[PDB]
Amino acid sequence: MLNQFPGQYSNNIFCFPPIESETKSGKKASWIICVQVVQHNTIIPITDEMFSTDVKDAVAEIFTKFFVEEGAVRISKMTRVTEGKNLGKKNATTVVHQAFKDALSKYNRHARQKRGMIPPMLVKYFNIIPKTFFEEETDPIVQRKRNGVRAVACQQGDGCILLYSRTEKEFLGLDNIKKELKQLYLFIDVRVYLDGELYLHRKPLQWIAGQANAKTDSSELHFYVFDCFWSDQLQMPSNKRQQLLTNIFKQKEDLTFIHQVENFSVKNVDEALRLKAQFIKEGYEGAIVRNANGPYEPGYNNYHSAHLAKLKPLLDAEFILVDYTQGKKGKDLGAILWVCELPNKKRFVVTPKHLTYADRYALFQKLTPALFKKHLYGKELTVEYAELSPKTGIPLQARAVGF
DNA sequence: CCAGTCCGACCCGCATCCCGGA
DNA sequence: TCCGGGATGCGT
DNA sequence: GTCGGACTGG
C-alpha cells in the first residue's frame, strides 16, 4: 500500500516529502524524490497488485527534483528500473516494490545529511598550495595525512560520548576509544568537538574501514585528533584552534587510544613538500596544509574548504583494455565504461576522465561486441589511482585519462 | 565552466544478512 | 549444517 | 574517494 511510505500521491505520481536544506549563501533548498510507472509512454496509476505481481512491459521510473528558494528547478534523468531483484526466491521483489524500496533508501540517507552532529571540514585543493596560504601574518601548519576513517567526537547533555563519521553516521563499535573520550571529557572542555581520524599504523585503509564499520568491538583502532572546534565559534581561525587543542592535550598526554597529531609550521612550498616526501617515507599517505586564518567550515552539502590543501602522490600505470560496459541508472544509462584486466585475468571497471557524456553515449550506441574486439581489445589504458589494492592488485580510486 | 557551489552517478572493499545448493 | 552469491549500506 | 554537469553570484 502507498500510504505506508511518507509522502502524497497525485496524478499517478508518488512524491516523498520534501527534505529542507540550507545552502552556503543562507537560502533554503528543497529536495523531492518521486516514483512513477510508465507503460507505452503513459503514466499508469499505481495499484496494490503491482507490489505482488509484475505488470509486463511496465517500467518504474525514479526521478528527483532540487530547487533553491525562488531559484530554478533541477530535475535529474529518470532512473529506469525494469526488473525486480532476487527474482527466483522468496525475498523476490517486483518492479514497483523495488523502486519504492530504492527510493525510500535514497530518502532516508538524504535526510540524515541535512539539519548535535556537525559535518567535518573537507579539503578542496589537491597537490597545490594557494599563495594566499603564505601571505598571512602567521605561518601555515602542515600535518601528517593518515589513510584511515574520518571521525568527529563530542559530548551530549546526557554525558554519553558521541562519535560520528564524515556522512554524520554514529559509529556503533570502537568502545575502546569511547572510554578514553569519556575519561578525557572529565578534565577538558565540555562543549568542544574533537575532529580526527581512526587509524592504526601499518594497516591498510580497507582493514581500517572494515573494523570501523563492524558492530564487533575488536577495539584495535586509535583516534588521531588533528583539529577541534566549538559550535558557537566556528569562525575561530585555524591557528587558535591548534593552540587550544594543544592546551587540551597538555592536560593528559598519556591516553592510550587518543593522540594529537604533530603540527609543522612552514614558510614556503618546499618546506611543505620536503615534509610531504618525509611523511611518505615514514609510511603515511601524505601531508595536509592548513591556512593560518582559516575558520572551521563544516561539510554541509559536501562542501570543501579552500583553507586546506592535500599533498598526495598521484600514481599512474598502464592497463590492458579487454571489455566495455555501461552505467545502470539515471544519466549513466547508455554511458560507456571501460573494463581492464590484470596479470591474473581479473577485471575491473574504469570511468573515462576526459569525455563528455555525449561522447560516452555515442561511443556505447555505436559499439558492438564485434567492433570492440576488432579495434580496441588489447589496447593500453593509462590509469591514475591513489593506491593499488593490497589483496587483488586493483587500482583504487581509479580513472582513465586516455590511451 | 569565470569560479563557487551543488547534485548525481560511479569505481572497489568490507560487514551483514538473506537466501539456496550443496 | 556449510558455503557461495545477491543485496545493501557503510567507508576512501 | 572519483568526475561531469549545471545553477549561482559565495
Author numbering: 1 to 115, 122 to 409
Give the article text.
AsfvLIG catalyzes the DNA ligation reaction during the base excision repair (BER) process of ASFV genome. AsfvLIG is composed of 419 amino acids and is one of the smallest DNA ligases identified to date. However, unlike the homologous proteins (such as HsLIG1 and SusLIG1), the fidelity of AsfvLIG is very low. By solving four AsfvLIG:DNA complex structures, including the non-catalytic open form and the catalytic closed forms, we showed that the NTD, AD, and OB domains of AsfvLIG undergo a large conformational change during the catalytic assembly.
Our structures represent several different states of the reaction: the AsfvLIG:CG complex structure captured the Watson–Crick C:G pair prior to ligation, whereas AsfvLIG:CT1 and AsfvLIG:CT2 captured the mismatched C:T pair prior to and after the ligation process, respectively. Owing to higher resolution (2.35 Å), the AsfvLIG:CT1 structure was used to demonstrate the overall folding of the catalytic form complexes. Unlike the extended non-catalytic structure, AsfvLIG undergoes large domain rearrangement and adopts a closed conformation in the catalytic AsfvLIG:DNA complex. AsfvLIG is assembled like a ring-shaped clamp and encircles the DNA duplex in its central channel. In the DNA, 19 out of 22 base pairs (bp) is covered by AsfvLIG. The AD domain of AsfvLIG mainly recognizes the broken strand at the nick site and the flanking region upstream, whereas the OB domain primarily interacts with the continuous template strand surrounding and downstream of the nick. As revealed by the AsfvLIG:CT1 structure, the NTD domain forms extensive interactions with the DNA substrate. In the AsfvLIG:CT1 structure, the nucleobases of the template C11 and the nick site T12 form one H-bond (3.1 Å) between their N4 and O4 atoms, respectively. Further, via the water-mediated H-bond, the O2 atom of the C11 nucleobase also interacts with the main chain N atom of Gln403 of the OB domain. Though not identical, the overall shapes and orientations of the C:T pair in AsfvLIG:CT1 and the C:G pair in AsfvLIG:CG are similar.
